[PDB]
RNA sequence: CGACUUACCAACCCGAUGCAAACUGCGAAUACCGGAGAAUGUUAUCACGGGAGACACACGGCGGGUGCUAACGUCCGUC
RNA sequence: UCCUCCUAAAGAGUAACGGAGGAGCACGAAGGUUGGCUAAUCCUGGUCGGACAUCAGGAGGUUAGUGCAAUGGCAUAAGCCAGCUUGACUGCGAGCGUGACGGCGCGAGCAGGUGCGAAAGCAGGUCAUAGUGAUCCGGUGGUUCUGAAUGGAAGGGCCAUC
RNA sequence: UGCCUGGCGGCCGUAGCGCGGUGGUCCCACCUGACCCCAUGCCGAACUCAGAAGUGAAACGCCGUAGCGCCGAUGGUAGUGUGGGGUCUCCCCAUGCGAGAGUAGGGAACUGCCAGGCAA
RNA sequence: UAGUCCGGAUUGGAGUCUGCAACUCGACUCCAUGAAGUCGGAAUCGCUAGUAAUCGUGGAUCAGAAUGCCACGGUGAAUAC
RNA sequence: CGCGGGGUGGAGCAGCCUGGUAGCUCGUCGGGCUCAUAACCCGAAGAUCGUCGGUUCAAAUCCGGCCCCCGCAACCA
RNA sequence: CGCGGGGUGGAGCAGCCUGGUAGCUCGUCGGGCUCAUAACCCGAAGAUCGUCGGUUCAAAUCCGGCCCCCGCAACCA
């Protein structure tokens, strides 16, 4: 065969889904570009992996012009 | 067109400003008047207000829309904002570069007592 | 022979011919032959059915074909073990669910149109039907 | 305009051998003179001596005259 | 290959250095940045040096 | 600078009754003369360019910009981010300052000179005039240059129709076909 | 150098019309993560210790790759 | 060995001598930050100049670009431009992801010290994802550590690094 | 109370395009100007400052129109979870879920605080 | 010391005589035009004194049409060991 | 069918595995020399690189298919 | 890993350890030569020392780096 090769897998996903509560910290989506976006209490690391800035529970959101999924957080 | 070229360049500004949660100094200027507004950190509702277009102001001075004008606004908005209760605000320059006019309505807002 | 001119991937999953078809109505001739069987016809089994077709009818009248291949089939060679790659790419055929008209017809007679057809469906593997296009 | 960059550009006057003074500014240094301006130059007459050049049937008849 | 490594050494202080990568060939000149040493506790042209 | 007073006063009012406006911001006015001199052969020879450049710098008030290659192509041997061409965009007092000197006296200057193009129009009022000599303008002196390089005026309008333009340059007393 | 004819081939566009594992201006079922609430289950769950065996699998049903939608073939998912 | 897409059955994972491509780097500006900007490709007019170099206006709007594959992503621009710079900083690190393990990755906030900004702020390299190898052994610099009777030393250790 | 502007949002196409309009007393715009602040890799075009002769042209705001975009039932169809079955590459049946495309139709957004002018 | 006030080609125009007649196809004139050419690759030609070299000039044929041919005379060399 | 290597004026070879303007030796063509031909001397033309394609700003030169040519393998039972 | 030497017209060489004057052989164009060709002979066209830095009256030359420069024995992650 001429190829047959392949890289090991990244385990990218959505790790804590809407309304699953989350401690300070805790990574939300792991992705590679901004799918979903950093809303309230949520950050953005520079692998663009979502993670909590605060301790509560994930909201997911679908807002603005373009129409994008932003994730926040509400205590 | 000029306005949504000045919007997209003040965006990055609000949109940081906003996420952050902060109570933002909104200064809009015209070639004839100058504008300033003290909006809460949620973005709909205004808390204090003022401009060269309020008569209270333009009786007083000689031109509406110039450095020492912007200064009698900035004066009023930060003489305001202290009797309301404000005082830790930020300053959205709203896309226009941070120089003249807008400069000598910060330094004012900064000399009047209001803390940033 | 019918064949893409070009395609982004020389070699293609076997897949699943399933479902119905969607080219269902006679659209642009006024006859057509229908497939009542489902199958999958070789860029062959289509010049061969055309040229039974448009011999039958003459210089005159006017056909369509409105099923291409664009699925390439691979074939290992003989004497051959399994494995040691995909095999090459050996003839181009068009998946046919049930519905799908083939070929379509215009300008000839309903007398000698139905004669045209079966010289066609004979040459086919699929079971095929004759239908006329229906206003609405 | 940028200061120190440019070159000079210092008021100077024009005089054709016409006799139309006339005051411009540019780049040159201390006076000028010009042979031709836009009023003087032959367009409007030279676009009626160009074009009334032909005629071949008056030159035969010039040359026989009979 | 081609980049090599090299070894920046502070001035004003112990003799505690960073690494970094260097193309020699297209830059043969030498580096001054202004890194923080941490035995000194403050900010020092570090310059560069081979190992 | 009586250009732009003698188009106040005359032209306007001239411009008015033709096509009927309703207002006086209607009518086109001349928004920028961009004067362009793409070198090209710069590629060979580096100082060739800063010839140019002083030339453009000499028929012009103020200093060329360098304009470099908007993409790299191998029809001309030419990359990207390389200096090609030089261009002045100048415009408001000096501008009719030059466009006094370009139609009054370095127009009638023009070797082999007849009439000037009517047809060249974008479709937008927007004119262009190519002098072939650097020689035209009284500028440049005549044992400085050495090559036969010229440039390319480029007159930018606020009309709509080169219909609504030719009558602005029409009422200034340029020389049309 | 002035220019006419044309048994003609045919883009970008239009209006129909298909096709696609590596196309998507849309989009299920189930599955899946978290929350709450009954009922039922021999704690069925999780932790840490003492022991291990096993790491040649096979067939059948649904989703597939490969092979010829060949093989009691081959290689994966889920029961 | 490492990265990307499909196969992979709408979380993750998932094989084959299944289907297609890439990597063994690059950069003191291609990093930082502040302040700006907007593309392709055509149309018409214009000197040499022509399909195409440079200019003007109009059209389209992200077909562009992203140091390199492919994927996902970006106008708030992560795109292309400038002005100062050195955060490609030392000590940490609440709390998570991902691995059998070795390991790998994301990370608000704290102490110290910088940069940029008028300040809110942003900065612990580069839009992200490949650019990489454990241990042993030995070398090089540092060092409130050890030192075979005592004082040194060698030699070890710890820290930085090859 | 209302009618007109501006500022900042909410909501992101029923909200956007085009076309047809109409508005200048303030508001906004171009416009005026270029020592001073500042600006151009050229250019007071941009950004900036000092202004008040002009206009509502362009740009903007408001009213009007379906030419498009956009929204979109009901019914059917495809698909599919579970237990069956068949003539088994593909279907079918019970029961649960149930699209996409199209169709009737909808359709020139709807608002929040705040400021100014005018009829009160 | 220049493609030159060198070269004088080539083209356009205006003509002149001859000649029944000048476009194919003449000669000359005027005007404007101003090409190649800056001493010539391998080779190679004639010439031993009024000869080579250079500047005129004539005639024959001939209505007209020589840069050819046949004659004529000016200044006047080098070299032949 | 498998893995190397090729395909360049009319001929045989360089330049090709490191993309930017293609040489060498012959032959062909023009002129010389010779009584003429050869030899010899002097100039000149002549190849878009097997083709269909991709990568690039640009391909003889990089990458892929197809079309020929040449070598080596094609084994144990 | 090193200590060492070595560095010029296009190129091979010296000259470089005792600072003041870069030669030398093939690539170079014109001659003379001969009814001619080869030779042979004569003269011409090119580097201020690979390159950058200290001192001292004068620095390829004395001394430090580089690109690098080849030699070596040692290098057993
Ligand atoms: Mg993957
Ligand atoms: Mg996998
Ligand atoms: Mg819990
Ligand atoms: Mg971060
Ligand atoms: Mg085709
Ligand atoms: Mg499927
Ligand atoms: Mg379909
Ligand atoms: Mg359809
Ligand atoms: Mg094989
Ligand atoms: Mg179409
Ligand atoms: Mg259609
Ligand atoms: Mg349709
Ligand atoms: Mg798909
Ligand atoms: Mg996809
Ligand atoms: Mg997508
Ligand atoms: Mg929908
Ligand atoms: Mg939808
Ligand atoms: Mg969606
Ligand atoms: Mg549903
Ligand atoms: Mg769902
Ligand atoms: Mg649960
Ligand atoms: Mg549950
Ligand atoms: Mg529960
Ligand atoms: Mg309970
Ligand atoms: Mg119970
Ligand atoms: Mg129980
Ligand atoms: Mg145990
Ligand atoms: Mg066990
Ligand atoms: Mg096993
Ligand atoms: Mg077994
Ligand atoms: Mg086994
Ligand atoms: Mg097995
Ligand atoms: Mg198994
Ligand atoms: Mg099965
Ligand atoms: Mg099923
Ligand atoms: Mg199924
Ligand atoms: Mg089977
Ligand atoms: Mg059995
Ligand atoms: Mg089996
Ligand atoms: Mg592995
Ligand atoms: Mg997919
Ligand atoms: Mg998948
Ligand atoms: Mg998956
Ligand atoms: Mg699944
Ligand atoms: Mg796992
Ligand atoms: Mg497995
Ligand atoms: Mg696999
Ligand atoms: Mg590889
Ligand atoms: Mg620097
Ligand atoms: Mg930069
Ligand atoms: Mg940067
Ligand atoms: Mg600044
Ligand atoms: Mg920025
Ligand atoms: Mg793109
Ligand atoms: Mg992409
Ligand atoms: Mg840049
Ligand atoms: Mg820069
Ligand atoms: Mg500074
Ligand atoms: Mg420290
Ligand atoms: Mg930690
Ligand atoms: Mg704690
Ligand atoms: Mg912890
Ligand atoms: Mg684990
Ligand atoms: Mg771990
Ligand atoms: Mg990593
Ligand atoms: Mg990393
Ligand atoms: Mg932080
Ligand atoms: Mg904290
Ligand atoms: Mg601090
Ligand atoms: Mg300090
Ligand atoms: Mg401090
Ligand atoms: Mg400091
Ligand atoms: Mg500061
Ligand atoms: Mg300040
Ligand atoms: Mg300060
Ligand atoms: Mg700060
Ligand atoms: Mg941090
Ligand atoms: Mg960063
Ligand atoms: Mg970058
Ligand atoms: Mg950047
Ligand atoms: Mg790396
Ligand atoms: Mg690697
Ligand atoms: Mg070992
Ligand atoms: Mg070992
Ligand atoms: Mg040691
Ligand atoms: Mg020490
Ligand atoms: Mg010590
Ligand atoms: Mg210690
Ligand atoms: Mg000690
Ligand atoms: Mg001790
Ligand atoms: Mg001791
Ligand atoms: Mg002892
Ligand atoms: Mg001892
Ligand atoms: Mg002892
Ligand atoms: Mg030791
Ligand atoms: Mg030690
Ligand atoms: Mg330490
Ligand atoms: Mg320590
Ligand atoms: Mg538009
Ligand atoms: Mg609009
Ligand atoms: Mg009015
Ligand atoms: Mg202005
Ligand atoms: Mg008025
Ligand atoms: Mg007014
Ligand atoms: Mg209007
Ligand atoms: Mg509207
Ligand atoms: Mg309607
Ligand atoms: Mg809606
Ligand atoms: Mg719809
Ligand atoms: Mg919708
Ligand atoms: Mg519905
Ligand atoms: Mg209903
Ligand atoms: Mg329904
Ligand atoms: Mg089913
Ligand atoms: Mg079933
Ligand atoms: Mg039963
Ligand atoms: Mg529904
Ligand atoms: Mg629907
Ligand atoms: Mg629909
Ligand atoms: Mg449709
Ligand atoms: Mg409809
Ligand atoms: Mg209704
Ligand atoms: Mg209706
Ligand atoms: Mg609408
Ligand atoms: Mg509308
Ligand atoms: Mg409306
Ligand atoms: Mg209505
Ligand atoms: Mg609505
Ligand atoms: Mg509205
Ligand atoms: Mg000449
Ligand atoms: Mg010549
Ligand atoms: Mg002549
Ligand atoms: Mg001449
Ligand atoms: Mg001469
Ligand atoms: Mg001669
Ligand atoms: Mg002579
Ligand atoms: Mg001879
Ligand atoms: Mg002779
Ligand atoms: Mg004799
Ligand atoms: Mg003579
Ligand atoms: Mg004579
Ligand atoms: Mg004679
Ligand atoms: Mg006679
Ligand atoms: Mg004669
Ligand atoms: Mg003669
Ligand atoms: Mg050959
Ligand atoms: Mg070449
Ligand atoms: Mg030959
Ligand atoms: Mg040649
Ligand atoms: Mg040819
Ligand atoms: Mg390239
Ligand atoms: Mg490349
Ligand atoms: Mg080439
Ligand atoms: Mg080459
Ligand atoms: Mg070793």
Redesign the pocket.
């Given at each position: 065969?001429?190829?047959?090769?392949?890289?090991?897998?990244?385990?990218?996903?959505?790790?804590?889904?809407?309304?699953?509560?989350?401690?300070?910290?805790?990574?939300?989506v792991?992705?590679?570009?901004?799918?979903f976006?950093a809303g309230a209490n949520v950050?953005?690391?520079?692998?663009?992996?979502l993670?909590?800035?605060a301790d509560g529970?994930v909201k997911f959101?679908?807002?603005?012009?373009?129409?994008?999924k932003f994730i926040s957080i509400e205590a | 067109?000029?306005?949504?070229?000045?919007?997209?360049?003040?965006?990055?500004?609000?949109?940081?400003?906003?996420?952050?949660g902060?109570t933002?100094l909104?200064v809009?200027?015209?070639?004839?008047?100058i504008?300033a507004?003290v909006?809460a950190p949620?973005?709909?509702?205004?808390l204090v207000?003022a401009?060269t277009?309020?008569?209270?102001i333009a009786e007083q001075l000689?031109?509406?829309?110039?450095?020492?004008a912007?200064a009698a606004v900035g004066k009023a908005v930060a003489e305001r904002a202290l009797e309301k209760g404000i005082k830790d605000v930020?300053?959205?320059?709203?896309?226009?570069?941070?120089?003249?006019?807008?400069?000598?309505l910060?330094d004012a807002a900064r000399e009047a007592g209001l803390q940033? | 022979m019918l064949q893409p001119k070009?395609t982004?991937?020389?070699?293609?999953?076997?897949?699943?011919?399933?479902?119905?078809?969607?080219?269902?109505?006679v659209?642009?001739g006024s006859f057509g032959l229908k497939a009542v069987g489902?199958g999958?016809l070789t860029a062959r089994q289509i010049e061969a059915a055309r040229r039974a077709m448009t011999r039958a009818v003459k210089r005159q009248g006017k056909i369509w074909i409105?099923?291409?291949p664009?699925?390439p089939?691979?074939?290992?060679?003989l004497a051959?073990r399994?494995?040691?790659?995909?095999?090459?790419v050996e003839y181009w055929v068009?998946?046919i669910?049930?519905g799908?008209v083939l070929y379509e017809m215009d300008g000839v007679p309903e007398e000698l149109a139905r004669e045209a057809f079966k010289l066609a469906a004979a040459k086919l593997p699929i079971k095929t039907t004759f239908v006329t296009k229906t206003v609405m | 305009?940028?200061?120190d960059?440019?070159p000079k550009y210092e008021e100077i006057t024009a005089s054709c051998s016409c006799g139309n003074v006339m005051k411009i500014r540019s780049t040159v240094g201390h006076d000028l003179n010009l042979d031709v301006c836009s009023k003087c130059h032959p367009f409007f007459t030279g676009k009626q001596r160009d074009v009334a050049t032909g005629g071949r049937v008056d030159?035969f008849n010039?040359?026989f005259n009979i | 290959?081609?980049?090599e490594?090299i070894?920046?050494?502070s001035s004003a202080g112990?003799?505690?250095?960073?690494?970094?990568?260097?193309?020699?060939?297209?830059?043969?000149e030498k580096?001054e940045?202004?890194?923080?040493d941490?035995?000194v506790?403050?900010?020092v042209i570090y310059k560069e040096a081979?190992? | 600078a009586k250009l732009?007073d003698y188009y106040?006063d005359e032209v306007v009012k001239k411009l008015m009754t033709e096509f009927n406006?309703?207002?006086?911001?209607?009518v086109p006015?001349v928004?920028?003369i961009?004067?362009?001199?793409?070198?090209?052969?710069?590629?060979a020879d580096k100082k060739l360019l800063d010839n140019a450049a002083a030339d453009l710098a000499a028929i012009?008030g103020?200093?060329?910009?360098?304009?470099?290659?908007?993409?790299?192509?191998?029809?001309?041997?030419?990359?990207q981010?390389y200096?090609?061409?030089?261009?002045?965009?100048?415009?408001?007092?000096?501008?009719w300052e030059f466009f006094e000197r370009l139609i009054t006296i370095a127009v009638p200057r023009i070797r082999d000179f007849r009439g000037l193009?009517a047809?060249?129009?974008?479709?937008?009022?927007?004119?262009?005039?190519?002098?072939?000599?650097q020689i035209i303008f009284p500028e440049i002196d005549y044992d400085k240059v050495d090559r036969?390089?010229?440039?390319?005026?480029?007159?930018?309008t606020?009309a709509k129709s080169?219909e609504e333009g030719r009558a602005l340059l029409a009422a200034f007393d340029f020389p049309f076909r």
């Open positions: 065969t001429r190829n047959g090769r392949d890289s090991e897998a990244k385990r990218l996903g959505v790790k804590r889904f809407g309304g699953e509560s989350v401690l300070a910290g805790s990574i939300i792991r992705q590679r570009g901004t799918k976006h950050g953005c690391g520079r692998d663009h992996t993670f909590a800035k529970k959101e679908v807002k603005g012009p373009k129409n994008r | 067109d000029k306005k949504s070229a000045r919007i997209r360049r003040a965006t990055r500004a609000r949109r940081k400003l906003q996420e952050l902060a933002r909104v809009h200027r015209t070639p004839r008047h504008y507004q909006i949620n973005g709909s509702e205004v207000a401009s277009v309020e008569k209270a000689k031109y509406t829309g110039n450095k020492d912007a930020s300053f959205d320059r709203s896309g226009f570069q941070y120089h003249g006019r807008v400069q000598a910060a940033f | 070009r982004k991937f020389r070699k293609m999953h076997k897949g699943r011919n399933r479902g119905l078809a969607q080219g269902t109505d659209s642009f489902r999958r409105r099923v291409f664009d699925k089939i691979t074939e290992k060679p051959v399994m494995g040691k790659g995909k095999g090459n068009a998946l669910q049930p799908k | 305009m940028k200061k960059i440019h030159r010039k040359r | 290959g081609i980049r490594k070894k920046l050494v112990t003799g505690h250095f960073y690494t970094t990568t260097k193309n020699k060939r297209t830059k043969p580096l940045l202004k890194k923080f941490p035995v506790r403050q900010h081979k190992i | 732009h106040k406006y309703n207002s006086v911001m209607q006015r928004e920028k961009t004067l362009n001199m793409g070198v090209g052969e710069a590629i012009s103020q200093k060329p910009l360098i304009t470099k290659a908007r993409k790299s192509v191998a029809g001309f041997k030419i990359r981010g200096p090609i061409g030089c261009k002045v965009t100048l415009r408001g007092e000096r501008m193009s047809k060249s129009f974008d479709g937008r009022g927007n004119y262009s005039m190519g002098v072939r000599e036969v390089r010229g440039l390319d005026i480029t007159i930018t606020t080169d």
